[PDB]
């Protein structure tokens, strides 16, 4: 087979892990995804002159959800800009990842979504400084405008690259 990438993508209740899937997969924006709807997709890409497959675990609300953090390769820590406690609770998403590799390695990239909006209450610099203190990539992201997206999903699939032989 082609190369396969294993991701995860987490974060609090309406942040957008839902509408940052689909806009990467269908190239549209959904206002109103059922936030109970836990599924994988998969869509190919090409990615540096490389064709692989990324299969990807929207998280909500299990076996296949144990799978996937004990097989997935690399996660998105999703948090929305305009939701102070979301990003405020991706220590505890970072440290759920962290027990089930028992590792401080893992692919990560910090994703700060719904840049549209107005109503900012996590600046840059917060972010920046979280990002920079788990040592990964920051990217501000609106699955409204699609700014960024494809940018998150792609930048994940260098650091698995960076982390490990594809
Ligand atoms: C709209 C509803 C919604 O999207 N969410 C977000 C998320 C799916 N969620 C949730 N809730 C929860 O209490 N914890 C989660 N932990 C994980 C996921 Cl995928 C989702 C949630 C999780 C990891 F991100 C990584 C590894 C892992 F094992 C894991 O599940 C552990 C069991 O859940 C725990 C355990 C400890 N803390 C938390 C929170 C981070 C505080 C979770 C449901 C809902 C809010
Ligand atoms: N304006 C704006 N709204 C968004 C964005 N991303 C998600 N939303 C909205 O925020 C709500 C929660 O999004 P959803 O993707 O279901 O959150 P999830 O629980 O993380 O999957 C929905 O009504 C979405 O339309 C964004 O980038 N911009
Ligand atoms: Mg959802």
Redesign the pocket.
């Known amino acids: 087979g082609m190369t396969e990438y294993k991701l995860?993508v987490?974060?609090?209740?309406?942040?957008g892990?839902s509408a940052l899937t689909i806009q990467l997969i269908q190239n549209h924006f959904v206002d109103e995804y059922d936030?109970?709807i836990?599924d994988s997709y998969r869509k190919q890409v090409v990615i540096d002159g490389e064709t692989s497959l990324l299969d990807i675990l929207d998280?909500?609300?299990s076996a296949m959800?144990?799978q996937y953090?004990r097989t997935g390769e690399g996660?998105l820590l999703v948090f929305a800009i305009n939701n102070t406690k979301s990003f405020e609770?991706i220590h505890?998403?970072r440290?759920?990842?962290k027990?089930?590799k028992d590792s401080e390695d893992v692919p990560m990239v910090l994703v700060g979504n719904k840049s549209d909006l107005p109503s900012r209450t996590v600046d840059t610099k917060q972010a920046q400084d979280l990002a920079r203190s788990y040592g990964i990539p920051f990217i501000e992201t609106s699955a409204k405008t699609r700014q960024g997206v494809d940018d998150a999903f792609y930048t994940l699939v260098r650091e698995i690259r960076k982390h490990k032989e594809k």
């Open positions: 995860v987490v974060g609090a209740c309406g942040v892990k936030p109970t836990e998280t909500a609300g959800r144990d953090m996660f609770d505890h998403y440290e759920q990842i027990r089930v």
